[PDB]
Paper text:
[name], a SET (Suppressor of variegation, Enhancer of zeste and Trithorax) domain-containing enzyme identified from [name], initiates DMSP synthesis by methylating methionine (Met) to S-methyl-methionine ([name]), with S-adenosyl methionine (SAM) as a methyl donor. [name] is a S-adenosyl methionine (SAM)-dependent Met S-methyltransferase containing a SET (Suppressor of variegation, Enhancer of zeste and Trithorax) domain, and belongs to the class V of the methyltransferase superfamilies. The SET domain proteins are well known for their roles in methylating histone lysines in eukaryotes, and [name] represents a new member of the SET domain proteins. Each [name] monomer consists of eight β-sheets and four α-helices.
The crystals of [name]-[name]-SAM complex belong to the I222 space group, and there is only one [name] molecule in an asymmetric unit. In the [name]-[name]-SAM complex, the [name] molecule is located in the same position as Met in the [name]-Met complex. In addition to the [name] molecule, the SAM molecule was also clearly observed in the [name]-[name]-SAM complex structure. Residues His93 and His138 form hydrogen bonds with the SAM adenine ring. The side chain of Arg133 interacts with the ribose ring. The amino and carboxyl groups of SAM contact with residues Arg42, Ala44, and His72 via hydrogen bonds. In the [name]-Met complex, the Met molecule is accessible to the surface, suggesting that [name] possesses an open conformation. After the SAM molecule enters into the substrate-binding pocket, the loop (Gln37-Ala44) generates a conformational change and participates in binding SAM via the residues Arg42 and Ala44. Structural analysis of the [name]-[name]-SAM complex indicated that either residue Tyr124 or Ser88, which are located between the [name] molecule and the SAM molecule, may act as the catalytic residue. After SAM enters the substrate binding pocket, [name] generates a conformational change to form the closed conformation, which brings the sulfur atom of Met in close proximity to the SAM methyl group and allows the nucleophilic attack on the methyl group.
Author numbering:
A (entry chain A), B (entry chain A), C (entry chain A), D (entry chain A): 11 to 171
The structure:
C-alpha cells in the first residue's frame, strides 16, 4: 500500500523500509546539494528506517562504510544523507537501520556525522551545517584535512585570534 | 571486455567480480538443483571472486548471512553456491570474497559449508555432497535438525548398527 | 620504555597502546565521575590509541558494544571515556582504535558520543557535557529515555516555552 | 558452583563460559601438541561454550581472527582448539560462541577448520587430522602454502601418480 524509496520490490515499507510518504530528496538552497528530508515527526530513540543498497569494494560519493574493506552503495537513500557536526540521526551500519538521536520535527533535514561511520571520504568539503561547533572542514574520522582544508581552517583560526 | 555474472554495470570483472567466462550456473543431475560451476582451474589459496548483492533484514533461500541481523540477497552468484560437508571454497562474508580452500579443476562444482556462515537456513535438506563424512542432513550451525531430519538421521543410524 | 595504561604486558605502548605519559584517569569536579584526560596535544584526524579489553556477552557500565550480541569490558581505558553530545574523539569498535575528531589541547577530557557505538546503556543519566546542543538526557541510540528522563526533559521543555 | 576454564571471575559457567568439568586441555600423542578435549557428549547444533579473550591488533599462535585488523588472544580455550579438515565444531567469531557441527562423543578432541575464521596463520603446518580428505598442509583461507608446504604437497602428489 505504501510506496518505497528503494526501487526493489523485495524491500517493503511494511517491513520498515523507507516510504516516499515519510522521506523526500530535495535540493538544499545553502550549498549542501541534494539531501534527505523527513516529512513526519519522529521522537528521539526510534527506528526511522531499515537501510539497504548494493555491496561494493570501493568507496564512492554515495557509499557508506560497512567494515574495513566493504562499502554499501546506496544512491537512493542513505548515501543522500547530509552531514552535520551535531547530528540528529545515527546510521547503524551493522544492523543497517537509521535511528533518531533527537526529536526531529517534520520537514527537517536528516543529518549524520560522516566521521561516525567513515574512515575516509570520497571527497572533503567545507561544512554548512551551521552548528555552533562546526569542524568547518569535514573528513573521515581517520583522514587528515588536505591542504585546501588546512588553508581554510588556518584563515578561520587567524580570525579567531 | 569481460562480461560479468552480476547484472550491475558498477561491478566490473577487472575489479574481481565474477565473469561468465569463469563461472556458470548449471542444473545438477543428482538432486541438488542449480549451482555454480567453475570453468577455469584455481590453485588453493586464491581469490576467485569478489561478491555482491542487496542488503536485506530477512533470511531467504538465496541470502547469505552478514552478521546477527543482516543478510545478503544474491540470487545471481553466491546464493547459488551449493553445500558440501567437505567444501572446496570459503565465502568470506566480511571481505565479501570467495576463496579456494583447495585446488579446484575446471568444471568442478563450487561448494561451501553452509554452516560456516549461516546460523539458520531457510530450509533444511538431505545432503547429496557424497563426501565420506556427510552430515547427511544439513542445517545452520546454530540450528537443530527438525523432526524430518531427526527421523532420516535415525534410520541411517540404525543401518550403522 | 613507556608504561602502559593496560596492565597486560602483551599490550605495548610501542604498538600504539595508551601510555600513562599520555593519558590519565581523573575525578571530574562537575558530576561526571571519573574520566580519561589527555596529557599531550593531538591534531584532528590522528590515532590516539589502540584499544583492548576482555570479550563478554553482557552490557556493563564499563563495556563498549562490539556488535549485536558482544561487548568489550575495558575498565582501564575506553570504558572510562566520558560522554559528550559534541564529541572530540571517535572510538572505532571495528578496528579498536581511538581517533581525534578535532584538535584536542593537552589537559582536555576525552569524550565520545555514547550513542555512536551503543544500542542501549547500562544506565541513563542527565548530561553535564555543557555543549550548546546537549540532549540533556543520555541513552543508547536504540533506547528511549525512561520515565525519569522523560520527566526531566519535559521540565526543560516547559522552561523553553 | 562450577569452575571455569577462563581465569577471570567475571566469566561465569552459569552464563555459558566453559567449565573444567566439561572441557580439558590435553597433550595429544600424534604430533598435534596440546588441544581441547570435551568430557561430555554434545548433540549436533548446540552451543557448547561462550568464548572470550583479550583484544589485540596482532596475529599470534593462540589468537583467533575477529575481523580484518583485529584478533582475539585466548590461550586458555579457543586458541587451543586443534585443526581438522573435517571439523566437528564451529567457532562463531561474531557471537563468540562454539557450536557443535556434529554429534560429539565424550572424550573426543574438538576441531575447527582454521581456514573458516583465519585469513593467515601464525605458522603453516602439516596436518595430522586423519580425515579422508586432508588438505595435508594447513594455511589460512587467504594464504598460499609456503615453499615447504608446496614441496611436501608435491611429494604427496607424485605418490598419487
Ligand atoms: C553523497 S553526498 C550526499 C548527497 C549529495 N548532496 C548530493 O547532492 O548528491 C555527500 C556530499 O554532500 C555534500 N554535503 C553533505 N553534507 C554537507 C554539509 N553539511 N555541508 C556542505 N556540504 C555537504 C558534500 O558535497 C559531500 O561531499
Ligand atoms: C539457494 S540454494 C542454492 C541454489 C539452488 N540449488 C537452486 O537450485 O536455486 C540452497 C538449496 O540448494 C539445495 N542444495 C544445496 N546443496 C545441496 C547438497 N549438497 N545436497 C542437496 N541439496 C543441496 C538445497 O535444496 C538447498 O536448500
Ligand atoms: C562507565 S562510565 C565512564 C566512567 C565513570 N564516570 C566512572 O566514574 O567510572 C559512564 C558513566 O559516567 C557518567 N558520565 C559520563 N559522561 C557523562 C556526562 N557527560 N555527564 C554526566 N555524567 C556522565 C555517567 O554516570 C555514566 O553512566
Ligand atoms: C595454537 S595451536 C593450538 C594449540 C597447540 N597445539 C599448542 O599445543 O599450544 C595451533 C598449532 O597446533 C598444531 N596443530 C593444530 N592442529 C593440528 C593438526 N590437525 N595437525 C597437526 N598439527 C596441528 C599446529 O602446530 C598449529 O600451528
Ligand atoms: C552519507 S554518505 C554521503 C557519506 C560517505 C560518502 N562516501 C562520502 O564520501 O561523502
Ligand atoms: C549458499 S546460500 C544457498 C546458503 C544459505 C541460504 N540462506 C539457505 O537457506 O540455503
Ligand atoms: C564509554 S562506556 C562508559 C559507554 C557505554 C557503557 N556500557 C555505559 O553504559 O555507559
Ligand atoms: C584455533 S587458533 C590455533 C588458529 C589460528 C592461530 N592464529 C594459528 O596461527 O594457528
Amino acid at each position: 500500500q505504501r510506496t518505497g524509496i528503494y526501487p526493489s520490490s523485495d524491500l517493503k515499507v511494511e517491513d520498515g523500509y523507507p516510504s516516499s510518504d515519510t522521506f523526500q530528496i530535495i535540493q538544499t538552497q545553502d550549498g549542501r546539494g541534494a539531501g534527505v528530508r523527513v516529512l513526519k515527526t519522529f521522537a528521539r530513540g526510534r527506528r526511522m528506517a531499515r537501510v539497504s543498497g548494493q555491496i561494493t569494494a570501493f568507496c564512492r560519493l554515495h557509499t557508506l562504510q560497512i567494515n574495513a574493506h566493504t562499502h554499501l552503495y546506496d544512491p537512493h537513500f542513505s548515501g543522500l544523507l547530509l552531514h552535520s557536526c551535531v547530528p540528529n540521526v545515527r546510521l547503524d551500519m551493522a544492523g543497517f537501520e537509521l535511528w533518531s538521536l533527537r526529536d526531529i520535527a517534520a520537514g527537517e533535514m536528516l543529518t549524520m556525522d560522516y566521521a561516525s561511520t567513515e574512515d575516509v571520504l570520497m571527497r572533503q568539503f567545507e561544512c554548512h551545517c551551521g552548528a555552533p561547533n562546526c569542524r568547518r572542514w569535514i573528513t573521515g574520522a581517520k583522514e587528515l584535512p588536505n591542504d585546501i582544508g588546512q588553508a581554510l581552517l588556518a584563515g578561520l583560526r587567524a580570525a579567531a585570534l
